[PDB]
Write a protein that binds this ligand. Structure first.
Ligand SMILES: [Mg+2]
Ligand SMILES: [Mg+2]
Ligand SMILES: [Mg+2]
Ligand SMILES: [Mg+2]
Ligand SMILES: [Mg+2]
Ligand SMILES: [Mg+2]
Ligand SMILES: [Mg+2]
Ligand SMILES: [Mg+2]
Ligand SMILES: [Mg+2]
Ligand SMILES: [Mg+2]
Ligand SMILES: [Mg+2]
Ligand SMILES: [Mg+2]
Ligand SMILES: [Mg+2]
Ligand SMILES: [Mg+2]
Ligand SMILES: [Mg+2]
Ligand SMILES: [Mg+2]
Ligand SMILES: [Mg+2]
Ligand SMILES: [Mg+2]
Ligand SMILES: [Mg+2]
Ligand SMILES: [Mg+2]
Lengths: 53, 187, 56, 52, 125, 147, 128
RNA sequence: CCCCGCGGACGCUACGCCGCGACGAGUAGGAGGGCCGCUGCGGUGAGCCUUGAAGCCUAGGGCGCGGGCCCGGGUGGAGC
RNA sequence: CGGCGACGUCGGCUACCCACCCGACCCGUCUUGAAACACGGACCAAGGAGUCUAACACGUGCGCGAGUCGGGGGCUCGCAC
RNA sequence: GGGGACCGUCCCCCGACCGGCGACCGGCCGCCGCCGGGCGCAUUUCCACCGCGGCGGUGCGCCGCGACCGGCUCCGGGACG
RNA sequence: UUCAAGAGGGCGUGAAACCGUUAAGAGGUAAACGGGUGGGGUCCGCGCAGUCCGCCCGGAGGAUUCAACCCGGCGGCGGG
């Protein structure tokens, strides 16, 4: 089936298919400092309905 | 009751990809988080493009990308396309390009890399510019499809230049009556 | 005219309409005017920052 | 009898599927999720000598 | 990768039970036995599971080592805690918290250990 | 998959999506392209102008091989040879220009769409267009003819 | 005596009767299973007063008390002991019940294991 | 520079969970969802079953807005 | 905060029978209009009706991409699959 | 026609420097945690029981009562301008 | 006789329509139906002095041993 840097020698036109996402580690990508520097702070407070008195 | 109309309540738009591709869904998760948690509008545009269908993500050729990246002030910027980058054999000189694409044709990739360029996926683009700073967001020709030749006013109306649907093209196929003044009329 | 009854409200009418049944169109939503901050966020740029300003 | 029983798949698609299946056969979570009792297997890409 | 493998097994798995509007997952190292990314006991580089001991007393705390991810034979280290309930819970708490070893499962493991020990003490009349 | 179709959803609805008034009858309006000049005239004139009538000369026993003549444009001309050919020609100190035989690659006529790089080249073809020949000569090339 | 759930809210059922099919009273060939009337003149479909009511989404149960037994638990069907252990960490919200085709000797063991695990069984004395 | 306490609920099937606001007629017709239902095939449940399958009966217990479903008792006798 | 609690009573709005008040014309269908003095329908069981092929058009998903496609043929102990 | 030269990709090596030991791993150390065995044998620790014990959560088998708070609402008195 | 004739030669199971008998209830506006209650009946609830469990206090009892150190094993993290 070939390497990514050499085609298959027993299929005459085939090469391994390419990834559209090199690093699929979503957790590492999100925890990375470069992503975290660009974010706004979380809005983790819940604002429930106020009973109109 | 209230006096309102409900025929426009539901807005028709992609809220997610119709694709079940797990890598696409993973980078959709990534850019969904980026769009929510940053103020950048680049991330929102990229996310809504990731939702889109294939006809709404037309391929971008190497020549068109080079032409758009040669414009003044775009030096050392990352060309971002949400779609496939296609080799154009009509060009001979490939400059050094930094490129981020959803897909790259094998020949286009080899040409870009031997020209000294760099290719990134969208997770790498998120790690490189999380807000999309220093990017040129490109798009392939959306109306560069055969169906848009048939779309429009009907072929048999005056001042319409829309292609008709014919099984064959020849002097016997839809050329006589309604096409020339000698056979009835032309319009 | 056949579909409405209208007239000239007085100060007490304006007060009671705003205070008992006053709701704001905030971000396209019907939000009860339970805090002056709701008025000040939307109409503060016009000098209206409280229910008294709105009533005036 | 002429119901079009057969389908033709692109060779590139079929090769893609083979590659995906091979890649997934080397991840213990996916093999365990197919339910294959790979618990004392010393190495999931399990390779044995040619004398077999 | 955990996210990639989760996208594969989130709905197609032999451990999946979808029944009575409920969803359960029965892989060996799943605390709370729920079909979830956080609690899946197969897709992560480090997992912790609490099981009843081989005999009818104690618990087994099994944690996934770091190196042999593709070698399931040696990938899990199991230890047996056969002490009183408070010391057992303290031991599990120290395994998870002090090691910084996946601290989002600390209370799940403590509660599962409590359930196991409570099931091991004799039934009443 | 028949389980994905409207017929599964139309169970219980009496008319099966075809209306109670006009119903689903056998062939209201005719069969095939019936009445294309009588009661489907608006459709035919609107979407297929030129449908009716004869135009031009008929020719019995047309042999398409006789008129077979595929074409290639000047912007794709350099793709008929290897990359090495063009690179060596560009860096060649002498005036030696490579030969591109488009007949070998499977084209007979060379059309002149696009521009050429500034490299002399000898092009062999059965036919040329005026602008293709002009553009080949403007880069210092030559056009030779084959039969 | 019985194991009690985590919380015991008041279950409010908007409707307690079944929706019977129109004219299922007049015929044996028509079962009481609900079918939407689609006749051009049907008064049940047109919603005339005093007629058979039509099921619609407004009758939906509160999502906090939906699928909830009168005991306060939610049932989960089990066919063996291994399926029973999935409720170990859901003792106080979900109750197991043994499938109808599980043999008597095997459901005895399931009942014993559920007693050990403090899992409530809705049919604990069912083949004996 | 946390330490007499070494400790601190839940969560996040991200196709998930949460919040807020407005709204809810419908033939013909269109669309979506269906952990609605039937039969067969590939996988999977170290699934169920002569200590009793299917089917059928039932003033039995329930769940779901509903399509329907689960469980008890009986009959049945080999598969689901 | 009170009362009551095993062979008599306690709870179970669902489920069986019955009573009463209010409401309630027989469905399907064609029709501007059906409860119709319009038609079909005594009852029950089982069966019973948008399918397959070909050709187009647009939409969607996938692969490759100025290419793409082996579908016809051929090669691999000829054949449990 | 061969055999060569060159070019482009490759496959292994000899090697110096560069980023990192990484989600490719071992050895040493340092910290931490766990387990097993000793020592520790009592103001420590753990186990089960009792009190109609206190504090927390859920909640009372059934039938009921009261209180205050808040939301909505319909009324009634009194007083001021 | 048989496991079973509640398998007895058109005999596996044995639905509905329809019919006989038994039991309960009812009955001058043909029956039947929707909503709301009530009465009776059949069943269900291990109903019948009514839940558990975390900590602390007190009392009455047991037992290895609690911490800390020593040895060994195994992991997590870091290391120019
Ligand atoms: Mg409407
Ligand atoms: Mg309709
Ligand atoms: Mg008509
Ligand atoms: Mg109901
Ligand atoms: Mg009926
Ligand atoms: Mg009508
Ligand atoms: Mg409304
Ligand atoms: Mg509606
Ligand atoms: Mg009719
Ligand atoms: Mg008429
Ligand atoms: Mg009618
Ligand atoms: Mg009449
Ligand atoms: Mg008549
Ligand atoms: Mg008629
Ligand atoms: Mg008939
Ligand atoms: Mg008749
Ligand atoms: Mg039928
Ligand atoms: Mg028998
Ligand atoms: Mg018989
Ligand atoms: Mg009878």
């Amino acid at each position: 089936y070939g390497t990514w840097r050499k085609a298959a020698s027993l299929k005459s036109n085939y090469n391994l298919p390419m990834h559209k996402m090199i690093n699929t580690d979503l957790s590492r990508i999100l925890k990375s400092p470069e992503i975290q520097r660009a974010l706004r702070a979380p809005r983790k407070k819940i604002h429930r309905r106020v009973l109109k008195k | 009751g209230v006096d309102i109309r409900h025929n426009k309540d539901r807005k028709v738009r992609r809220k997610e990809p119709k694709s079940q591709d797990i890598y696409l869904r993973l980078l959709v998760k990534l850019y969904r988080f980026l769009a929510r948690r940053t103020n950048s509008t680049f991330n929102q545009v990229v996310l809504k493009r990731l939702f889109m269908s294939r006809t709404n993500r037309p391929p971008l050729s190497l020549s068109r990308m080079i032409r758009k990246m040669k414009l003044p002030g775009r030096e050392n910027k990352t060309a971002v396309v949400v779609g496939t980058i296609t080799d154009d054999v009509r060009v001979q000189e490939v400059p050094k390009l930094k490129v981020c694409a959803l897909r790259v044709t094998s020949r286009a990739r080899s040409r870009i890399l031997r020209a000294g360029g760099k290719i990134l996926t969208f997770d790498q683009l998120a790690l490189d510019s999380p807000k999309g700073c220093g990017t040129v967001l490109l798009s392939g020709p959306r109306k560069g499809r055969e169906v848009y030749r048939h779309f429009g006013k009907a072929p048999g109306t005056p001042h319409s230049h829309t292609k008709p649907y014919v099984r064959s093209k020849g002097r016997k196929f839809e050329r006589a009556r309604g096409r020339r003044a000698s056979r009835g009329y032309k319009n | 005219e056949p579909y409405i009854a209208w007239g000239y409200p007085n100060l007490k009418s304006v007060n009671e309409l705003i205070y008992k049944r006053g709701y704001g169109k905030i971000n396209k939503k019907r939000i009860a005017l339970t805090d002056n901050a709701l008025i000040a966020r939307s109409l503060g740029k016009y000098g209206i920052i409280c229910m008294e300003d709105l009533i005036h | 009898t002429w119901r079009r029983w057969h389908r033709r798949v692109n060779t590139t698609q079929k090769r893609y599927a083979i590659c995906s299946a091979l890649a997934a056969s080397a991840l213990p979570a996916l093999v365990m999720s197919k339910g294959h009792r790979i618990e004392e297997v010393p190495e999931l890409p399990l390779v044995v000598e040619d004398k077999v | 990768s955990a996210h990639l493998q989760w996208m594969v097994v989130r709905n197609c798995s032999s451990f999946l039970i979808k029944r009575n509007k409920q969803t359960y997952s029965t892989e060996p190292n799943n605390l709370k036995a729920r079909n979830s990314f956080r609690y899946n006991g197969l897709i992560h580089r480090k997992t912790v599971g609490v099981e009843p001991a081989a005999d009818g007393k104690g618990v087994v705390v099994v944690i996934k080592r770091r190196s042999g991810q593709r070698k399931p034979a040696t990938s899990y280290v199991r230890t047996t805690i056969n002490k009183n309930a408070r010391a057992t819970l303290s031991s599990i708490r120290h395994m998870i918290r002090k090691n910084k070893y996946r601290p989002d499962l600390r209370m799940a493991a403590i509660r599962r250990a409590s359930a196991i020990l409570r099931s091991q003490k004799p039934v009443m009349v | 998959p028949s389980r994905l179709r409207k017929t599964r959803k139309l169970r219980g609805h009496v008319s099966h999506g075809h209306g109670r008034i006009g119903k689903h009858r056998k062939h209201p309006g005719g069969r095939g392209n019936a009445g294309g000049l009588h009661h489907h005239r608006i459709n035919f004139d609107k979407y297929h102008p030129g449908y009716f009538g004869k135009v031009g000369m008929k020719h019995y026993h047309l042999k398409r091989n006789q008129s077979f003549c595929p074409t290639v444009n000047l912007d794709k001309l350099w793709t008929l040879v290897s990359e090495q050919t063009r690179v060596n020609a560009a860096k060649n100190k002498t005036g030696a220009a490579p030969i591109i035989d488009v007949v070998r690659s499977g084209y007979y006529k060379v059309l002149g769409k696009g521009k050429l790089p500034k490299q002399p080249v000898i092009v062999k073809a059965k036919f040329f267009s005026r602008r293709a020949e002009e553009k080949i000569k403007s880069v210092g090339g030559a056009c030779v003819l084959v039969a | 005596a019985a194991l009690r759930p985590l919380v015991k809210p008041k279950i409010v059922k908007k409707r307690t009767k079944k929706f019977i099919r129109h004219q299922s009273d007049r015929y044996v060939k028509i079962k009481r299973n609900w079918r939407k009337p689609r006749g051009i003149d049907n008064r049940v479909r047109r919603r005339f007063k005093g007629q058979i009511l039509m099921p619609n989404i407004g009758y939906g149960s509160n999502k906090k008390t939906k699928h909830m037994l009168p005991s306060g638990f939610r049932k989960f069907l089990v066919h063996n002991v291994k399926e029973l252990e999935v409720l170990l960490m859901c003792n106080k919200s979900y109750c197991a019940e043994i499938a109808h085709n599980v043999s008597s000797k095997n459901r005895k063991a399931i009942v014993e294991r559920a007693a050990q695990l403090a899992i409530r069984v809705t049919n604990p004395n069912a083949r004996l």
